[PDB]
Each structure stands twice: as structure tokens, then as C-alpha cells.
Design a protein around this ligand. Sequence first.
Ligand code: JHJ
Ligand code: NAG
Length: 351
Amino acid sequence: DLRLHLLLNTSVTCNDGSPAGYYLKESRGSRRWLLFLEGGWYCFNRENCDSRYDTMRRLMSSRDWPRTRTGTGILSSQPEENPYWWNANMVFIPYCSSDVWSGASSKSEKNEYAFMGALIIQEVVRELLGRGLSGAKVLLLAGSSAGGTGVLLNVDRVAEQLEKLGYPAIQVRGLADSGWFLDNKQYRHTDCVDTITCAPTEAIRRGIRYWNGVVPERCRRQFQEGEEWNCFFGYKVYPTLRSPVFVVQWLFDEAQLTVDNVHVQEGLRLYIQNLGRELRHTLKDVPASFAPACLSHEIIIRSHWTDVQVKGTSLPRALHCWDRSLHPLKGCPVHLVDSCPWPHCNPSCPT
Ligand SMILES: COc1ccc(NC(=O)Nc2ccncc2)cc1
Ligand SMILES: *[C@@H]1O[C@H](CO)[C@@H](O)[C@H](O)[C@H]1NC(C)=O
């Protein structure tokens, strides 16, 4: 199992001021480190954060965290379940900041909650450097859903942080799972007046102000003050990133359809087919990517993540090919995007 460590710097906190932390497996044999970012939506004002604290408190507090966790999928240490990185050092960072891992604000007089997701990541990295990460050769920053978007926001900040601390030999990379969202046309429309009616662009715009959210500097320089919400969307922030990033995205992601107000007539058929085509287009020039034509959400820490295949290649294989490419390869591809246009036209889609 993975063992819990609460942060020694107790001023880096979850939403309610309790200390953040991380779960760690060690692997003295290995110089490879995997840091996984958990997902789970977000909140963007007092009222919907208060609701989250009553019925989703583990995503806002460490008071009730268990001592241990079992690694699954890419966090598993058994080769039978994890053909990719089963011998690596494993780290699971719980999502307890409700800020898509972007915040840098403390609980104070004027703030009922702390939003410190961006600071949680640097503090975990800092404390791991005394536990063997100083000798690493690859640091893979991974994440699912809101954690996948967090990879896109923080992967270059982790690189920068290690360069400034004097560790130029650690290769920082990113693996973003199910966090590649589109600010597309919704199937049905509502003005942003409450949680259920606010589109992602409007909700994130409010969240950034509420969290004191931070985005990558090169992306901020393009869109400039007040327009930082653009950098939460993968196809806009990805071209500004310098670290290598592998993008995993279902073509018909359930969270995307939810925020598009989709829950089949001709109008909805065309909408669903157009969504797959628009997602497929934004990945055209992403060299390392895995995008199956399925209706689902998340993959990389699911125990049966090895089942799905695109063009006959599994995700663990594609990630292995990505490793080899960073040392095209005969029979070991890294760009795998389905072209069939309906959910589950790939027979290997999860049931
Ligand atoms: C662009 O940045 C992001 C956009 C969307 C999400 N996820 C999200 O909205 N999840 C959700 C779950 C349940 N009900 C409604 C919504 C995370 C980041
Ligand atoms: C704890 O973290 C905060 C925020 O990053 C930082 O300002 C402070 O210096 C840290 N404390 C110590 C003792 O390193």
C-alpha cells in the first residue's frame, strides 16, 4: 500500500485549514517517480463550497483521511495490473483544495476557505526531494479529470521549481487524463446564475478570483489580465508548455457532455458527432496522445485500464512507446486517436 504523510509545513492546507499531504510508496531500486493528482470537480463561491463541505468533505479536509491507500492502475506495483511503471516510486496527492489545483490563497479573516492547490504541489515536491527524489531521472506528473487539468496548469511550474532548487537532471513530464475540455457550444443554454446553470468558462472566471488562481506564465502572457480562464482549456494552454505532455482523453467524455447539458434524436446525434470531430481536431498536432471513441470518464488509475485499445495498441503500450521516444518507432506508436464517429464504435470501450 501507499502510506500517508501530512505536510511538515502545516501552513499549506486543505480548504478548511487542515494540513494537506501525500501517499507514498517507495522503490529504492528505481529512479522514476510518479506523482498523481486526484480529481473531483471544484467549487467557486461561499454557497457551493459550503455544500461541498457537508457531503464531499474528504475533498476539502484531511481530518478523516485513512492511514494507507492501495495503488490501482498506473499506481499499482504489480506488473500484471501495471505493465508500464510497476517498479516506480508511487505518490498519490489527494485533491482537497477544490480549485482545479490552481489556488494560492490562505484561510484568513477575509477568506472562509483556503485554496492552495498550486502550493500543495510544490510543497509535496520539496519534501519528496529529501526522500530520494533528489536522485530521480524522471518525474511524471499525472492526473485524472480536474487533476488532469491540474497537470496542464502545473507541469512547467514543477520543472521551474526543480531548476531553481538546483536539480537540472530531473526530467519533468506530464500525463493529463480526462482533463482536456472544450469551451464549445452547449446543447442547451442557461445564463450563469447558480451552480447548475454556470458554464465552465463563467464558473472558472469566478473561481480564479475566489481562489487567487494561477496559470502558466507563457499562457498568461498571451491572454493577459482578467482572461486567465483561457489557460484552463487544454488546446489553448498546451502549445505554451515546454515539458513533454501525454494527453489521454475519451472522445465523448461524460464530464464534457454534462457541462454541455447533455444527459437519440437527430439534433442530439449531430451534436454528439460534432463533439467527437472537434475533440479529434484539437489533438491533430498533439504527438503523444490516446483518444478512444467511448462514452466514459477517467482511465489511468482504473484497475482494468489495460483493456482499451486504439488501432490495436493499449494505453500502457503507448506510454511505453512514449518513454522510448524520449530517450517514429517501428510498431510502437505514440499518437493514437480513433476516427470512427459514435460512442463505443471502438469494441474495446469499457462496459
Ligand atoms: C476547464 O476546466 C475544467 C472544466 C470542467 C471540470 N469538471 C467538471 O465540471 N465536473 C462536473 C462534475 C459533475 N457535475 C458537473 C461538472 C474540471 C475542470
Ligand atoms: C511554508 O509554505 C509557505 C507557502 O509556500 C512559505 O511561504 C513558508 O516559507 C513555508 N515555511 C517554511 C518553514 O518553509
